[PDB]
Design an enzyme around this catalytic site. Structure first.
Site, PDB file in Angstrom:
ATOM      1  N   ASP A 332      46.591  44.691  25.907  1.00  0.00           N
ATOM      2  CA  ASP A 332      46.480  45.381  27.180  1.00  0.00           C
ATOM      3  C   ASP A 332      45.962  46.786  26.928  1.00  0.00           C
ATOM      4  OD1 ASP A 332      47.312  46.908  29.621  1.00  0.00           O
ATOM      5  OD2 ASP A 332      48.149  44.943  30.116  1.00  0.00           O
ATOM      6  N   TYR A 463      46.912  54.983  33.162  1.00  0.00           N
ATOM      7  CA  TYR A 463      45.896  54.645  34.154  1.00  0.00           C
ATOM      8  C   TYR A 463      45.335  55.912  34.784  1.00  0.00           C
ATOM      9  CZ  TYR A 463      47.273  49.679  34.411  1.00  0.00           C
ATOM     10  OH  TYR A 463      47.535  48.359  34.107  1.00  0.00           O
ATOM     11  N   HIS A 521      48.108  36.425  30.866  1.00  0.00           N
ATOM     12  CA  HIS A 521      47.852  37.816  30.531  1.00  0.00           C
ATOM     13  C   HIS A 521      48.919  38.354  29.597  1.00  0.00           C
ATOM     14  CE1 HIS A 521      47.338  42.140  30.925  1.00  0.00           C
ATOM     15  NE2 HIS A 521      48.601  42.213  31.303  1.00  0.00           N
TER      16      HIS A 521
HETATM   17  C1  LIG Z   1      50.762  44.874  38.812  1.00  0.00           C
HETATM   18  C2  LIG Z   1      50.188  44.687  37.376  1.00  0.00           C
HETATM   19  C3  LIG Z   1      50.002  43.231  36.885  1.00  0.00           C
HETATM   20  C4  LIG Z   1      50.525  42.150  37.450  1.00  0.00           C
HETATM   21  C5  LIG Z   1      50.053  41.011  36.646  1.00  0.00           C
HETATM   22  C6  LIG Z   1      50.405  39.599  36.989  1.00  0.00           C
HETATM   23  C7  LIG Z   1      51.389  39.331  37.924  1.00  0.00           C
HETATM   24  C8  LIG Z   1      51.735  37.930  38.297  1.00  0.00           C
HETATM   25  C9  LIG Z   1      51.066  36.939  37.703  1.00  0.00           C
HETATM   26  N1  LIG Z   1      50.030  37.248  36.716  1.00  0.00           N
HETATM   27  C10 LIG Z   1      49.707  38.464  36.372  1.00  0.00           C
HETATM   28  N2  LIG Z   1      49.308  41.385  35.670  1.00  0.00           N
HETATM   29  N3  LIG Z   1      49.202  42.779  35.716  1.00  0.00           N
HETATM   30  C11 LIG Z   1      48.403  43.620  34.750  1.00  0.00           C
HETATM   31  C12 LIG Z   1      48.983  44.597  33.997  1.00  0.00           C
HETATM   32  C13 LIG Z   1      48.120  45.428  33.076  1.00  0.00           C
HETATM   33  C14 LIG Z   1      46.769  45.208  33.001  1.00  0.00           C
HETATM   34  N4  LIG Z   1      45.894  45.958  32.166  1.00  0.00           N
HETATM   35  C15 LIG Z   1      45.030  47.002  32.606  1.00  0.00           C
HETATM   36  O1  LIG Z   1      45.001  47.328  33.805  1.00  0.00           O
HETATM   37  C16 LIG Z   1      44.145  47.667  31.611  1.00  0.00           C
HETATM   38  C17 LIG Z   1      43.293  48.641  31.995  1.00  0.00           C
HETATM   39  C18 LIG Z   1      42.410  49.298  31.008  1.00  0.00           C
HETATM   40  C19 LIG Z   1      42.470  48.905  29.715  1.00  0.00           C
HETATM   41  N5  LIG Z   1      43.363  47.878  29.322  1.00  0.00           N
HETATM   42  C20 LIG Z   1      44.159  47.278  30.175  1.00  0.00           C
HETATM   43  C21 LIG Z   1      46.163  44.149  33.802  1.00  0.00           C
HETATM   44  C22 LIG Z   1      46.922  43.414  34.620  1.00  0.00           C
END
Ligand SMILES: CCc1cc(-c2cccnc2)nn1-c1ccc(NC(=O)c2cccnc2)cc1
Ligand SMILES: CCc1cc(-c2cccnc2)nn1-c1ccc(NC(=O)c2cccnc2)cc1
Lengths: 545, 545
Positions: A332, A463, A521
């Protein structure tokens, strides 16, 4: 209820005892000649003394050398000029491995409430290659409640005394436990004392009898999950990198240093499955608790969380730790921090590895704020900009928050597209999400008590440095990652999908690649087996060197 | 006031720049041909870009390869089939070492209040052997307040911008600092800006000018003490080995694991001189904070401090740390714990090493209580038996206690012979002892704040398990230490004198030996240089293997 397994022949593959047969046939020496010198004067035997830890292994070897001048002598024979009882015994030792299916059973029974343990006649390994046994001992020892060793209790397997002992330490009555040995002799006592017994002729049947006598499915059972980390048995480390910034990590394993940088909004715990595994692989794992998370300091300033300071701080961490470098594996955001690390501090990076996060160069022409409104998925990335706001609904109910986030691709209860306008990330989700099938209720109450400390401001500030992280990122438009690097993608990741990382070769010429289909993820907790499989294979040949 | 040293040619031995000369002569190539391709298009130069961290080293190599097809071409020449600018540069790098006398000076000035620093044009080492430079960088980096690197500040040595920069970060005016380079070019700016300058032709004179311009003796100065440990820059580790017993250690260095078990009544700090040194030697130091001392748990029960549980706990410590084994080096009591470790857990002990404390077998016939009243020196050993008593006068005044104990052989202010009858260990000593010449007032207020935690009960209970420690000790009357072991004796130690250890061969056949004359009982702080010298020499050949 309980279960006791002898080491050799039950948890150990080629039961050492056997060798004196094997060896004998090879040199075509008088059948049974060896396994005969191995057992002279019943109790007064050199072997028994060793058993009781009265003599070291290195001591007994010679007393066994001799017998082999008396055992072969009376049967009117002779032996080769250099008959190494030493060499023969090293090989046998180094040769024994774990009886995976057996360990799998002892693990299950514990899993379904069984105080498991090892009862084993053993010497005090002072050999010059003792470390090998000691090394396997650790792998096993770890999965058992108890580990009784003859040379440690001055009692040996047959003596009914050790049993009463084992039965004592096991706080139980004979009728509540089973005992599995590959030796009848040592077994009678258990049976003649109460406890259910099983001669381990062949594993396949032993377990057959076992699952039988326990009404618990132990054989041909689902391939289990790698070892998870109990936060209380872990070695917790601390390092103050700056005046008001202390960093916490978890240390396990020895050898090349492997730094694990988790993502958002996780902890060092996210690697629970790769920590024991990699440690076992031959590495020294340092599971980072990133800045702002859990046990690491969490200052307010948005700026203290840009990659530049996050990276100067990681080096500082290496420095105060006495490490020339280390292999940074990230996920991440942890994956981004790592890419930069290899981009600005090559010397210090032995190997680069990121999971999901793609190495994406910076667009000097279009500002990230712009260039990010230029992507649907990244809508929640907006909702994170106003300090205070995101902190709020997230810090609102810790349990709900993690049971909602830590959800597989299909399990989802969110939809990060159109969120600001939605007025929240949980706007249309249950205020009591069902438990994900990737995590237990406990694993969640753990991330709960962790975030109870510094909250979600520190995490939300990663972020909040787009403009900065981008500007610093331009300085490296001429650079090129020529160090060992791995890019691992997940099929079902929706925000950080495989495609983004397709051009990573132009910047990383020798970039190797891993992919995991039907993978969300939260790579680490969703496909640990693959993850460990892929990272260990790469570590052996690309890092360790 | 301040001091800035360029890395190459001032702190680095064979200043890399020189090689393009050396190399040139070897292949008998047109004088200056190389140090000419190294500097093409002034600023547009590949070299300069590298300097500013615009390109990685691995990138620049080829751009320098080329010039060597143009630099030799215009001067109508030719070059060997495989002209490795790569190979030539590795060797040069791996060849540079620290200018010990120079580092010695920068250390002194700091010591007498000088904000020291390094200003250096450097590339971003992404080579396959980058770790070597990164490794030396650490040794140096560590002894300087600041370390400005061209490729990190996007500015290079000559540009007056970097100076204003360095002068900025140095919170000082030109007239308050000196600047030492081996290049005139980069120097003018300092002089043309204010700061005192010195061309480093020969070290000998540079320092000659330096000590001059500073009125501080820097040359032919007393051989200094190894690096001490600043308790705030250390990595503090924790491990809970039992329900109510957590263990604290300090970690530094990578490689084979080296566990340091201090004595009575010290701390992990007692090894302050061997921690940075050994870490530097190629080891991973774990400076134990023994049970009952400082940051480790300190339960009341006298029994929780016998060698048996102290040793089962040390293994447990290894286990939860993911270590197959480790090399235990001990002192005082730490030395005893270690002997037993090698006597009961060979597998886990890679190498044994004790300072002052002799491996003495147990006398089954005469009980320790008896067999100890059978020795004058050991009279205070009686005064320690009654719980409460010794705690008292010791916990009475922490400062006084340590300024009285931590005293050389000659400095003494005590006399442990006839103490109980004397009615105390401090009965006839000043209630304000003069500072020992082995320790600073600070080093003492450190052991003061440490003992402010759990007091002197835990420490005093190690002396309170004679009968137990002896009984367990008999089990090992048949044993024999056949693992790598070192016995180090001190001439002036009066309670644990060299003689006691004279028969250690009958039990430890291959026992190596070290001795240090004019050496007290606090070996570590009194003769650190020797200690490091003796233990590192032994570690290289007996442990590391
Ligand atoms: C509200 C946040 C969230 C919910 C879920 C989720 C929920 C339910 C089901 N599935 C998935 N996944 N994510 C999530 C977290 C961090 C990142 N990473 C970044 O945003 C990022 C940005 C820049 C560089 N590296 C990483 C991307 C996505
Ligand atoms: C009051 C205690 C004391 C004062 C001084 C001292 C004071 C002033 C000047 N010079 C020296 N040295 N010691 C001391 C400490 C621990 C031990 N070790 C043991 O008693 C021991 C016992 C058993 C095993 N290993 C070690 C031996 C001697």
């Amino acid at each position: 209820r309980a279960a006791v397994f002898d080491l050799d022949g039950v948890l150990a593959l080629p039961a050492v005892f056997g060798v004196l047969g094997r060896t004998e046939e090879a040199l075509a020496l008088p059948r049974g000649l060896l396994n005969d010198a191995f057992q002279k004067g019943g109790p007064e035997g050199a072997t028994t003394r060793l058993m009781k830890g009265e003599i070291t292994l290195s001591q007994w070897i010679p007393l066994m050398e001799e017998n082999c001048r008396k055992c072969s002598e009376t049967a009117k024979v002779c032996l080769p000029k250099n008959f190494s009882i030493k060499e023969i015994f090293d090989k046998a030792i180094s040769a024994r491995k774990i009886n995976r299916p057996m360990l799998q059973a002892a693990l299950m029974l514990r899993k379904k409430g069984f105080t498991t343990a090892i009862l084993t006649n053993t010497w005090l390994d002072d050999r010059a290659e003792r470390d090998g046994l000691a090394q396997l001992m650790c792998e096993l020892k770890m999965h058992f409640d108890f580990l009784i060793e003859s040379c440690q209790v001055g009692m040996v397997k047959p003596e009914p005394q050790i049993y009463k002992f084992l039965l004592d330490t096991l706080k139980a009555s004979p009728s509540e436990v089973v005992f599995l040995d590959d030796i009848g002799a040592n077994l009678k006592p258990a049976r003649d004392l109460g406890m259910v017994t099983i001669l381990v002729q062949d594993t396949d049947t032993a377990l057959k009898e076992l699952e039988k006598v326990t009404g618990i499915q132990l054989l041909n059972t689902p391939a289990p999950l790698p070892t998870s980390c109990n936060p209380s048995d872990m070695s917790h480390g601390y390092v103050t990198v700056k005046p008001r910034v202390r960093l916490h990590f978890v240390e396990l394993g020895s050898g090349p240093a492997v730094c694990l940088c988790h993502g958002f909004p996780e902890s060092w715990y996210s690697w629970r499955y790769q920590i024991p595994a990699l440690a076992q692989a031959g590495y020294r794992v340092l599971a980072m608790d990133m800045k702002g998370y859990g046990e690491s300091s969490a200052p307010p300033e948005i700026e203290e969380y840009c990659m530049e300071v996050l990276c100067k701080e990681m080096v500082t961490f290496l420095d105060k730790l006495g490490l020339s470098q280390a292999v940074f594996i990230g996920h991440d955001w942890g994956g981004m921090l790592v890419w930069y690390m290899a981009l600005f501090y090559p010397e210090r990076v032995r190997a680069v590895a990121s999971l999901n996060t793609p190495f994406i160069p910076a667009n000097p022409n279009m500002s990230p704020l712009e260039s990010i409104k230029a992507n649907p998925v990244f809508d929640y990335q907006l909702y994170f900009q106003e300090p205070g706001v995101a902190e709020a609904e997230l810090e609102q109910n810790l349990s709900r928050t993690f049971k909602s986030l830590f959800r597989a691709s299909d399990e989802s209860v969110l939809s990060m597209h159109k969120v600001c306008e939605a007025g929240g990330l949980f706007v249309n989700s249950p205020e009591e999400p069902s438990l994900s099938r990737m995590v237990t209720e406990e694993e969640i109450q753990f991330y709960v008590q962790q975030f109870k400390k510094s909250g979600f401001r520190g995490p939300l500030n990663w972020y909040r440095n787009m403009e900065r992280n981008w500007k610093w990122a331009c300085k490296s438009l001429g650079r090129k990652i020529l160090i060992p690097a791995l890019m691992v993608t997940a099929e079902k990741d929706f925000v950080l999908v495989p495609q983004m990382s397709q051009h990573m070769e132009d910047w990383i010429p020798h970039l190797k690649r891993g992919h995991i289909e039907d993978c969300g993820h939260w790579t680490q907790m969703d496909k640990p087996t693959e993850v460990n499989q892929i990272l260990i294979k790469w570590l052996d040949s690309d890092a360790r060197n």
